[PDB]
């Protein structure tokens, strides 16, 4: 044999070793060809949906989602006892490669071992190809190890005007890159070292941004309490007062909450929503080169005010979906909606205004006038939390290679990397297909929980009530399932 | 200032080192005298209640309860992540001894410092005194360090006939031991070593004793099935079937559940209980030399059957009480009743029989008579879980010196020992009182989780509740209260 | 250093102040403790107080102890960046009162989510000082910039009242930032050239409430105006549409503008009345950590130093009662307090 079967996790000090071994089956895509693809074939009825690009015969491996590397238990173990984590090393092995050739005479096909076939598999470490991993697409290794999966088909999109290309478009030939070729006695391994990244914050702040103050003392600062003495003409006056625990709205604070871009508000009780088709017109959306595009998920913002759980920001959520969910027009309870509310202390709510500002200058003939600030970007002195990472969410994304950026952490959450884990492309050699094994390993560094807090934490736990099936487990028919999206913010720190 | 204040606990590897320091005050008991106490002074109206003993001027420290050494957050870290723990080393300090004199002038009183006065402290490492730390008495160091506590008065009992003494009765003068004397500049300490004890299991089995079998495969043993061929006369037969997963009750097994000594069953819904008074008549006890003894808590057994919460064994489980609960005849709501639900896998149910046996020989004319087994001692091949320790429970007891015992582990939980932490006795050297500081330290060896379980566990978790005041914290008046009993068994192992 | 709360941790809240406004609601606790960088605490004194009839008697207690620890791990909540009274006084011969320590936590209304935290300061190891004991530690400062544009418009108010509007616009006219639905006045705000954006100090002896302009010192940040925007003026103008043969050009005012690549700005000017350092809230990200009230923002600011009188009970009873002891000798302590800060120029 060309490799062994390793799946497990080792817990050593601050380190976690995540070992997954999966079994893949790769067919031949595009009948061994490259193909133009565009909107007009599929019908291209939108200027926002207009695209041009090429689908290539190759497949690729994608482990970029968490449920690959962490069993639901080891996720629970990690979340409850840690204040942060991040990847250190990467180790990937390809082995036990097989190539089956297909012969179908009339009704029934016969599949037999072809021993001399080769498999072409290379890794692009210079990021010369288009890199599609940071887009949260399907095709990643199945959460549950016994399941066998179909390796995705690679493809890419280059620049376009409508469906038509432009002279600055590009065409990348995956045959142009030197690629080791593997037979049933060959095995391909490489390793990778993660670049410096900040520990993911996996805690909920105990205190909010505006309650940082001491409740027992006054401030020495003063504020303007009264602009008139009473009812009548000529009451203009200036009165002042100490900012104190009596009125805490006004106390001078060092820090202020982060950015906001307002999302429309949708209720999960369908009769509180307006009787109109506001799904597309209503939603926030950013425009690029004349193409409109939705704002999704957007800046990291609390999902709803405290105490209001039937509301979710229209486009501003990560909405996963339950096992078995249909592709199109599925009912609202077929999907799972994540909520970021744990950040609501530091970050504004997505469906509310960040604040107000004063429009005019008051006089005897003018009232002080204010207006709603809908979208407020970074100002010096802001603090915020990023979006959480979930068992079902992405791990990393590639930071676009550009003049500059601010807070490179990706807006769907996870660890942004300029040199993320490289893409691994594979194909059959030019009716035949391959099957083989994959063992990927990551080494994670942990941040241990330091708290002196007296009273016990919120922990993640499996609820205690009899049910037909154990959660995070197979049903009777064999289909694995993930009942709900498990974020990591449970323990607590001071602000 | 001969010593400092040490409180926080650190977690290192497979060890826990916790420290608590408490502020104490010692009065003057029995007017500096020994006084023989019998029941006839209190009236002793029953023979079970008769006693003979000596109330002594001495005080003593008792740290035997858990929440002394663990904060409710550090009890969580222990129970969520660990299969076992047990004490290894002890360290005890008594320092900053400050003796005051109380001056009484008319009705008002002033109190002053008395410098020459000494306090005496002696600890018994030869175990020549009667050892009273094992009855889970009141007067232990408070759970919340910011409280200040009053040392309990020492005392002991010995033989009696009725309320009168006997020729073998004893008298102990603790004055006859050597002790140390301390002025305002002297501190006292000594170190201890726990004797080798088994890890206290803090997990719930992921299997039940009767289900250990493989669901997929027949046994090769046969069991008696049909003894009749049908209805009629002289129809006797012997038929035999395979033990198989369709019928799992009749299969043969290697091991059988723990012993039982039955209890009466009491319901939390008062209308279901009988109108009679079964508190003493109903209770199961054990008679020693004409004196009955309530069986409390009793042998380790499950509290109730599946899907039957509202019931609890009358004397089968430990019962604490909520803060502010009065001493006598408090309401049911006031007390907190612990339950053994976790051990129902290997242990019989307290309110239920152990099983049945046959009482005769069958023959042509004699039907099979079976009858219930109310109490069952140890048989070879029994397996049983000991009782679970609680945040509020006793840690150790002293195994009564005897020719023989079986499984010395005590009935109220914790670790049995032949040389526990030795008693620590203290007094005012003969209107005088004395204060000071006590910092006790214990070290706990841990047993880490090796489990491969795929799905998440069950954790002790604070609910996401929003209430008037935070749990395990002080309320407005400054009262610190514990809202629930917290058992140690959450994580699971295979059986 | 008086004895606070009679040796008790006490929950406090909005309704325990009487409350009645939602934007003002709060929940938290109060503690019996009071609260290069070198520090020493020496020559401690314990002054016990008896009252015979109505005459008070201050008595030397030599035997008693006093407690202190420092929090270098920042495990406790941190109130020192909020501009609270109770610092070492301006006048070097003044004798001051050690202020009380207590910390706010999460709430909804006056109740507490399960996420609220409760810290018991008795649960750190602490060094207990008698009259002959001294306590000393040093602190090293982390690398910080030598102290020496976006706008969020403030409403404009005049010190000549006949210029001001004849209506009550104190609260209704102010720029605020709502957080979890609680309106929060924007103070002092971003550094700009200011109804709620200006630091204001009181003159010596000034009252607590409804004082008039003459009683307080209203600072102004005109010095930094060369590279900063006017607080009362809109940042600029923009186009609101497309001109055509049929459409005149149109414009609109910019009331607030976030950062843009290539902005330069000055931070807020600091005074001998004002703060030194602040603690950066531990977070995923922040921008320009410099605290909006001025000074040096830090990840590990100087530690907190917590201190209290070690409780000595009164005479306990003669038979054991499990209740804690609620009767204590009246007491308070004082001593010498010396802070030494080395500075760079």
């Amino acid at each position, epitope marked *: 044999s060309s490799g062994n079967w390793h799946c497990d996790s080792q817990w050593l000090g601050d380190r976690v070793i995540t070992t997954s071994t999966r079994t893949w089956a790769l067919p031949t895509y595009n009948n061994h060809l490259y193909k133009q693809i565009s909107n007009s074939t599929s019908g291209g009825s939108s200027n926002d949906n207009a695209y041009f690009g090429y689908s290539t015969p190759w497949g690729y491996f994608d482990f970029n989602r968490f449920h690959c590397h962490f069993s639901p238990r080891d996720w629970q173990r990690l979340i409850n006892n840690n204040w942060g984590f991040r990847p250190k090393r990467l180790n990937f092995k390809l082995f036990n490669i097989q190539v089956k050739e297909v012969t179908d005479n009339n009704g029934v096909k016969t599949i037999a071992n072809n021993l001399t076939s080769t498999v072409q598999v290379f890794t692009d470490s210079d990021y010369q190809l288009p890199y599609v991993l940071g887009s949260a697409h399907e095709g990643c290794l199945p959460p549950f190890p016994a399941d066998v999966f179909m390796i995705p088909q690679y493809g890419y999109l280059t620049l376009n005007d409508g469906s038509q290309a432009v002279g600055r478009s590009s065409f990348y030939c995956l045959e142009y890159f030197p690629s080791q070729m593997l037979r049933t006695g060959n095995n391909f391994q490489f390793s990778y070292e993660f670049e410096n990244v900040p520990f993911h914050s996996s805690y909920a702040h105990s205190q909010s941004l505006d309650r940082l103050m001491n409740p027992l003392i006054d401030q020495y600062l003063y504020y303007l309490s009264k602009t008139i003495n009473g009812s009548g003409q000529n009451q203009q006056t200036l009165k002042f007062s100490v900012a104190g625990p009596s009125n805490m709205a006004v106390q001078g604070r060092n820090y202020i909450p982060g950015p906001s871009y307002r999302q429309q508000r949708v209720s999960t*009780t*369908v*009769t509180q929503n307006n009787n109109s088709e506001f799904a597309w017109p209503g939603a926030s959306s950013w425009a690029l080169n004349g193409r409109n595009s939705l704002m999704n998920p957007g800046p990291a913002m609390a*999902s*709803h005010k*405290e*105490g*209001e*759980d*039937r509301f*979710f920001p229209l486009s501003g959520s990560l909405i996963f979906g339950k096992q078995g969910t249909g592709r199109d027009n599925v*009912d609202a*309870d077929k999907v799972m*909606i*994540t*909520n970021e*509310e*744990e950040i609501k202390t530091t970050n504004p709510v997505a469906t509310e205004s960040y604040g107000q500002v004063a429009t005019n200058h008051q006089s005897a003939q003018a009232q002080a006038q204010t207006g709603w600030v809908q979208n407020q970007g970074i100002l010096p002195g802001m603090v915020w939390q990023d979006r959480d990472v979930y068992l079902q969410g992405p791990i990393w994304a590639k930071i676009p290679h550009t003049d500059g950026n601010f807070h490179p952490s990706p807006l769907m959450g996870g660890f942004g990397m300029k040199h993320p884990p490289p893409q691994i492309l594979i194909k059959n050699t030019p009716t035949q297909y391959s099957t083989g094994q994959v063992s990927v390993e990551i080494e994670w560094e942990l941040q241990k929980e330091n708290s002196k807090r007296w009273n016990p934490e*919120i922990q993640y736990t499996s*609820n*205690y*009530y*009899k*049910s*037909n099936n154990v959660e995070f487990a197979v049903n009777t028919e064999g289909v694995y399932s993930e009942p*709900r999206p498990i*974020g990591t913010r449970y323990l607590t720190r001071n602000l | 200032s001969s010593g400092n204040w040490h409180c926080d606990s650190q977690w290192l590897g497979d060890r826990v080192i916790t420290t608590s320091t408490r502020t104490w005050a010692l009065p003057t008991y029995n007017n500096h005298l020994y006084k023989q106490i019998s029941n006839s002074t209190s009236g002793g109206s029953s023979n079970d209640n008769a006693y003979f003993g000596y109330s002594t001027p001495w005080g003593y420290f008792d740290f035997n309860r858990f929440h002394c050494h663990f904060s409710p957050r550090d009890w969580q870290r222990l129970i969520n992540n660990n299969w076992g723990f047990r004490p290894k080393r002890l360290n005890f300090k008594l320092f900053n001894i400050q003796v005051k004199e109380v001056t009484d002038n008319n009705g008002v009183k002033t109190i002053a410092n008395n410098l020459t006065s000494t306090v005496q402290v002696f600890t018994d490492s030869d175990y020549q005194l009667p050892y009273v730390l094992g009855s889970a008495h009141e007067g232990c160091l408070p759970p919340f360090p910011a409280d200040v506590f009053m040392i309990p008065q020492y005392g002991y009992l010995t033989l009696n006939d009725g309320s009168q003494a006997v020729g073998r009765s004893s008298f102990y003068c603790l004055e006859y031991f050597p002790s140390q004397m301390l002025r305002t500049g002297n501190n006292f300490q000594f170190s201890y070593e726990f004797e080798n004890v088994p890890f206290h299991s803090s997990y719930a089995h992921s299997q039940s004793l009767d289900r250990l079998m493989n669901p997929l495969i027949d046994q090769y043993l046969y069991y008696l099935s049909k003894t009749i061929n049908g209805s009629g006369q002289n129809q006797q037969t012997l038929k035999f079937s395979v033990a198989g997963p369709s019928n799992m009750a009749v299969q043969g097994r290697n091991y059988i559940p723990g012993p039982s000594y039955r209890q009466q069953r009491v319901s*939390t819904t008062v209308t279901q209980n009988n109108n009679s008074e079964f508190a003493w008549p109903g209770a199961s006890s054990w008679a020693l030399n004409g004196r009955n003894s309530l069986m409390n808590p009793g042998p380790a057994m499950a509290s109730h059957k*599946e*899907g*039957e*919460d*509202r019931f609890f064994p009358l004397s089968g489980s430990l019962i604490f009480g909520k803060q502010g609960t009065g001493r006598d005849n408090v309401d*049911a*709501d006031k007390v907190m009743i612990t339950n053994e639900e976790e051990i129902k896998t290997t242990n019989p149910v307290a309110t239920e029989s152990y099983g049945q046996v046959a009482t005769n020989h069958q023959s042509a004319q004699a039907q099979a008579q079976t009858g219930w087994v109310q109490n069952q001692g140890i048989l070879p091949g029994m397996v049983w879980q000991d009782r679970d320790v609680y945040l509020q429970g006793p840690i150790w007891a002293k195994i009564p010196h005897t020719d023989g015992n079986f499984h010395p582990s005590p009935l109220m939980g914790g670790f049995g020992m032949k040389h526990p932490p030795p008693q620590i006795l203290i007094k005012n050297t003969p209107t005088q009182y004395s204060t000071g500081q006590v910092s006790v330290e214990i070290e706990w060896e841990l047993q880490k989780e090796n489990s491969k379980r795929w799905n998440p566990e069950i954790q002790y*978790t604070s*609910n*996401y*509740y*929003k*209430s*008037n005041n935070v749990e395990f914290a002080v309320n407005t008046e400054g009262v610190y209260s514990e809202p629930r009993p917290i058992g140690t068994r959450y994580l699971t192992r295979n059986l | 250093l008086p004895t606070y709360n009679n040796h008790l941790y006490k929950q406090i809240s909005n*309704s325990t102040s009487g409350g009645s406004s939602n934007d003002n609601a709060y929940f938290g606790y109060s503690t019996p403790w009071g609260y290069r960088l070198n520090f020493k605490l020496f020559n401690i004194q314990v002054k016990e107080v008896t009252d015979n009839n109505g005459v008070k008697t201050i008595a030397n207690n030599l035997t008693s102890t006093v407690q202190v620890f420092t929090d270098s791990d920042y495990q406790l909540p941190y109130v020192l960046g909020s501009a609270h009274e109770g610092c070492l006084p301006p006048f070097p011969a003044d004798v001051f009162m050690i202020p009380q320590y207590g910390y706010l936590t999460l709430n*909804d*209304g*006056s*109740q507490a989510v*399960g996420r609220s935290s409760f810290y018991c300061l008795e649960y750190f190891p602490s060094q207990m000082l008698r009259t002959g004991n001294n306590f000393q530690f040093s602190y090293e400062f982390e690398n910080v910039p030598f102290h020496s544009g976006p706008s969020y418009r403030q409403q404009r108010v005049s010190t000549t009242v006949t210029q001001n509007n004849n209506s009550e616009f104190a609260w209704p006219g102010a720029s605020s930032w709502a957080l979890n639905g609680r309106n929060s006045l924007m103070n002092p705000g971003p550094a700009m050239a200011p109804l709620s954006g200006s630091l204001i100090f009181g003159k010596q002896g000034t009252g607590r409430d409804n004082v008039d302009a003459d009683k307080v010192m209203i600072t102004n940040e005109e010095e930094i105006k060369t590279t900063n925007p006017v607080a009362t003026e809109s940042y600029g103008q923009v186009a609101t549409n497309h001109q055509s043969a049929q459409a005149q050009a149109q414009t609109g005012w910019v009331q607030n503008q976030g950062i843009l690549p290539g902005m330069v700005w000055q931070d807020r000017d600091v005074y001998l009345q004002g703060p030194i350092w602040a603690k950066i809230p531990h977070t995923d990200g922040n921008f320009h950590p410099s605290p909006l009230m001025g000074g040096f923002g830090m990840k590990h600011p100087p530690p907190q130093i917590l201190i209290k009188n070690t409780p000595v009970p009164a005479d306990p009873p003669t038979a054991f009662n499990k209740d804690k002891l609620n009767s204590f000798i009246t007491q308070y302590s004082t001593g010498q307090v010396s802070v030494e800060i080395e500075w760079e120029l």
Partner: antibody
Amino acid sequence: EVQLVESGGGLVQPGGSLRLSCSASGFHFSSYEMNWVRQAPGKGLEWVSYISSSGTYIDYADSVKGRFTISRDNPANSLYLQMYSLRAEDTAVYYCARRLWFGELPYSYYYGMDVWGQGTTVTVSS
Amino acid sequence: ALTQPASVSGSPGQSITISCTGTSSDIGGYNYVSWYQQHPGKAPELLIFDVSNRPSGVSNRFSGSKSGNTASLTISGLQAEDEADYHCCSYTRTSTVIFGGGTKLTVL
């Protein structure tokens, strides 16, 4: 030890008014919803109204809708149902009940009613 | 509302099943149902929540099922205790709950 006990009221005249109040003891009252359901003497249960923990959502089944209000005081652990313009169509045992909760994070819902009040009889008769 | 029979009877020892039928907004579309036993003059006690989920206090013998556009309670091993009136509850499309007429169970 979870106890929902409502005082409420007895016999009252048609066209009159009534105020029912409930008392939650033993469980955190501020987290849960609360329901008012009624059982007419010979007929099955009917759900009158529900109120959210924060009070943001108060919905009435439309029979009553417009004639009753619902209120809850979280510091006082007390739910209130005040009713006007009573009919004979409203005579029932009214229950104070709460819906299932498991103490988790937001966007988690459970459908069923965990604990029930022992009831109060309301007789609206001319 | 939800339609379920007026009454059901069974002999001790044998499992019987009550059904409650509803519109696609009540049941067919949404998975909300729940089941309650009630005894005369006692507050109802929850048996089954969601479809098949069951609370800790409630006994084994009570299970639940949804065959679509319908919901059913299957009681096993009837006893004398099991005599009670069983109710069907399902939150609707508009998130306002509805019940059904109740069904009495008479153990013969």
